[PDB]
Amino acid sequence: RVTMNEFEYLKLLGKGTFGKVILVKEKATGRYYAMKILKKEVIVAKDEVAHTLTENRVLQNSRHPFLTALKYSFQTHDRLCFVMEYANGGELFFHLSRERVFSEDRARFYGAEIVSALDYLHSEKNVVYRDLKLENLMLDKDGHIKITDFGLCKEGIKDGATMKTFCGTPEYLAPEVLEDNDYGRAVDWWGLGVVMYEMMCGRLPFYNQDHEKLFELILMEEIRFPRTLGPEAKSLLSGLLKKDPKQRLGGGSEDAKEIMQHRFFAGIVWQHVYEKKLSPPFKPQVTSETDTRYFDEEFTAQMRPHFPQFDYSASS
Amino acid sequence: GRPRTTSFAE
Numbered sequence: 001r002v003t004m005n006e007f008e009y010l011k012l013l014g015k016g017t018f019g020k021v022i023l024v025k026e027k028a029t030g031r032y033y034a035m036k037i038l039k040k041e042v043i044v045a046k047d048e049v050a051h052t053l054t055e056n057r058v059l060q061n062s063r064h065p066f067l068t069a070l071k072y073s074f075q076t077h078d079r080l081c082f083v084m085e086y087a088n089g090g091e092l093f094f095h096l097s098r099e100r101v102f103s104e105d106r107a108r109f110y111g112a113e114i115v116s117a118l119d120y121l122h123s124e125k126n127v128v129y130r131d132l133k134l135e136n137l138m139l140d141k142d143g144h145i146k147i148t149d150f151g152l153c154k155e156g157i158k159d160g161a162t163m164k165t166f167c168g169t170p171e172y173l174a175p176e177v178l179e180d181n182d183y184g185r186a187v188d189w190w191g192l193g194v195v196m197y198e199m200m201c202g203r204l205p206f207y208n209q210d211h212e213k214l215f216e217l218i219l220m221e222e223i224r225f226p227r228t229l230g231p232e233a234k235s236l237l238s239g240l241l242k243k244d245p246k247q248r249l250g251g252g253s254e255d256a257k258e259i260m261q262h263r264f265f266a267g268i269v270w271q272h273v274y275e276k277k278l279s280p281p282f283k284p285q286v287t288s289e290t291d292t293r294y295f296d297e298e299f300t301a302q303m304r305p306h307f308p309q310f311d312y313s314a315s316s
Numbered sequence: 317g318r319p320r321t322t323s324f325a326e
């Protein structure tokens with residue numbers, strides 16, 4: 001268990017309402033980490049406590065190649081801290097903005113890795129991520145997926161276990177969440193569908209600037225694909241983007257296993273995905289460990305109760 | 317392409 005002093009504070013990575021994330025060096029070890037620094041007042045007043053704590057419990061209790069690992073969690077008088085694995089490759093949202101579209105091979109790589117992570121969270125851990133999107137999907141130094149931001153997760157979902165909270169990101173909300181229905185772990189697959197649609201098609205499958213119009217598209221409009229899209233992809237995205245979750249690929253008792261079996265993923269050995277044996281079709285070209293070029297330019301340039309049982313240190 | 321999105325809770 002350690003404090004604020006045991007770190008150097010090098011580069012800003014992102015600001016939010018609730019606080020900031022800074023690229024840190026661990027004095028004792030020389031290892032680079034990302035630190036989320038939450039102002040306690042903002043948390044309590046904006047009523048973000050429950051999420052903050054859910055992210056704590058979720059991170060502590062998860063260990064996976066494509067999930068951001070948590071090393072320390074500690075609190076000062078006025079702050080809450082999360083020292084986490086640094087993902088210097090930046091956000092998928094960054095890269096895809098630059099490149100417009102990824103190739104199917106490339107989208108399959110990220111897809112497989114996301115499936116690996118989501119499967120683990122579902123069938124072990126009994127968690128539902130709920131907020132899958134390009135912004136929450138980062139790359140490490142090698143070009144492997146790291147998922148961050150676990151505040152909107154739900155714990156204790158075991159199969160058909162259904163939820164009620166209306167949360168996520170409007171553009172990614174699954175039809176059953178948009179109806180005010182009870183929803184199972186299959187919203188994550190809807191999310192996978194939208195993410196992968198965006199990677200292969202270069203755009204959101206449903207978009208209006210206006211949320212209600214947007215929700216109306218999501219509920220009523222049937223998917224359309226670019227004519228250059230291969231049928232294996234087309235099938236996958238159809239399956240994932242089914243509006244009735246009971247029909248959605250991943251919606252049954254098989255969960256991720258159903259998506260893993262899809263012919264879009266024919267050549268993928270799922271053990272090798274997990275073991276990082278696969279060749280990333282993009283390596284982030286960071287020279288130094290402090291190279292923050294895949295992070296947003298506006299941040300990169302430097303620009304109250306006690307929480308019981310919040311403190312935590314990673315074991316062995 | 318698209319603008320940056322914001323996560324939310326009811």
Ligand SMILES: NC[C@H](Cc1ccc(Cl)cc1)C(=O)N1CCN(c2ncnc3[nH]ccc23)CC1
Binds near residue numbers: 068
């Ligand atoms: N993406 C969504 C997220 C929204 C956000 C911003 C600030 C804060 Cl206060 C909390 C959430 C964001 O932009 N962040 C900035 C970057 N950040 C990271 N960058 C690199 N390695 C990391 N490991 C863990 C987080 C992390 C994760 C958080």
